[PDB]
C-alpha cells in the first residue's frame, strides 16, 4: 500500500520510479588468533551479565522498530509461566519452543535477550569498547566517525561489501563467535549455550553484534595481509614462525588498527596503512568473504574523500551554518528518501507514520530543500497532537529522536548542538532559517527537484495540498509550519 499522506503532499514525485567452504588450516589459524585477541579486547573492562525481565518489558515498550501485541503479551503473566518452563528446559540443555505461537516466538526472543543481550545493552560494540564498531551511534554521529577514520594517514579509504554476507559465514566464524561462552559462568553460561547451540540446527540484535564482531575480525586479518605479516604462502598452512608474528601484531597493533575502521554489521569502512590492502585478497577470499561486484582477484578500489564514501546507505557532508560553525550531516539520493516515505505497510497511522518520516527528515535531512519543505507540509497536514508511530529507521539500529510530539527545533538543538560531542560552541539555534541547507548544486546532484517547474508548481501551491489532507483526515487541531521556511 501507498501512504496517502506522503503521496498527496509529493505531486512532482508521482511519475518517478550450497557454498561457503570452510577455511584452510592457515586461514583458520590466523582467524582463531585474531578472534581470541578481539574477544579479550572486548572483555578487558566490561563484565557480562544477564538482562532482566524488567529490561525486556522496557525495551519492548520503547521505540525498538504488531509491535503492540508484544506489549500486551508481556503484561500477560501466562506468557512468563511459559518462559519459566522453557528456561528450565534449557538450564538442563534441552529446548522445544523457539494461539500460543506468539508466546513461543516472543519467549525465545526474551531467553536470547536474557542470555546474550548484554552485548547490545552494555554496548560491547559501541566504538569505545570495540574501537572499530559504531553501535548506538545515529546518523548525526556516523559522518564524524568517517571523518576521524578518514583523517588517519595511509592509503585510500576502502569500503568493500561481501557478496551475500550471511551466506558466507562459516562454521569457523560460528566457532569464533561462540567463544563468548568462555566469558560466562554458571547459569548464564548454560542459558547462553542453549541459545547459541540453536544456530547449529538470533535475533536481529544479537545477529548485529555477532556480524560486527566477525567483520571486525575479517578486516584485521585483511590488514595483517596488506601489511605483509602474512601472505599467499600462509593460506594453506601458515609458514613456520609466523604464528608468534601474528600474535605480536595483534598485541601491539590491534587497537590502533581498529580505530581505522567503522564497522556496522556486514558494512565497513577501512583506512589501511597503505594501498597494499587493495590486493590483500588471499585470506579474504579463502575466508569465503568474496567481495561484491568484482572479479575474485581484481584489486579493490577506494576513495580519497571521506565525504563520498558510502556507509550505512548514506554519504556524509560538511555543512557550514550561517554563524560559521560546521556540521557533518548524512545525505543520500532523494528519490529513495521520498520513495520509502510513500510506502505504507488506518488513517491515524498512515498520518502518524507520514509524520515520523517528516520529523526524521527535519532531524537528518533538513539540508535538502525539498525534504524540509515536504516535511513541514506533512507536519502542517497531520494533527499536532498525534504522536509519530511506525518504522522509518531502515536497518540502521540507532535513532528515533523524531518519534516525539516535542518541537522539532528543540530536538534538532539537542542532537546537533547540546549532545553533539563534535560541537564545541553550545549556543543554540533559535530559528529554522538558521539551520543550513546544502549548496544548491550539491542538492541537485543528490536528486533535488529544485529548479524544475513540476516542483515550482508544488512549492507555490503547497497550501492547497495541505488543506486537501486536512479535509480527508478531518476536524482536528493543525498548526502551520510553512512560515518556518523563508
Ligand atoms: Ca559498504
Ligand atoms: Zn528454547
Ligand atoms: Zn548527497
From Swiss-Prot:
RdRp catalytic domain residues: 155-280
Topology relative to the membrane: Peripheral membrane protein
Subcellular location: Host endoplasmic reticulum membrane; Host nucleus; Host cytoplasm
Motif (Nuclear localization signal): 44-46
Binding residue positions for Zn(2+) 1: 86, 90, 95, 98
Binding site for Zn(2+) 2: 315, 331, 446
Post-translational modification note: Phosphorylated on serines residues. This phosphorylation may trigger NS5 nuclear localization.
Domain of life: Viruses
Region forming the signal peptide: none
Quaternary structure (record): Homodimer. Interacts with host STAT2; this interaction inhibits the phosphorylation of the latter, and, when all viral proteins are present (polyprotein), targets STAT2 for degradation. Interacts with serine protease NS3.
Domains: entry comment: Contains a PDZ-binding motif that binds to several PDZ-containing cellular proteins. These interactions seem necessary for an optimal viral replication.
Role summary: Replicates the viral (+) and (-) genome, and performs the capping of genomes in the cytoplasm. Besides its role in genome replication, also prevents the establishment of cellular antiviral state by blocking the interferon-alpha/beta (IFN-alpha/beta) signaling pathway. Inhibits host JAK1 and TYK2 phosphorylation, thereby preventing activation of JAK-STAT signaling pathway. May transcriptionally regulate host genes involved in antiviral response when localized in the nucleus.
Protein name according to UniProt: RNA-directed RNA polymerase NS5
Native organism: Kunjin virus (strain MRM61C)
Shown stretch of the complete protein: 2850 to 3420 of 3433
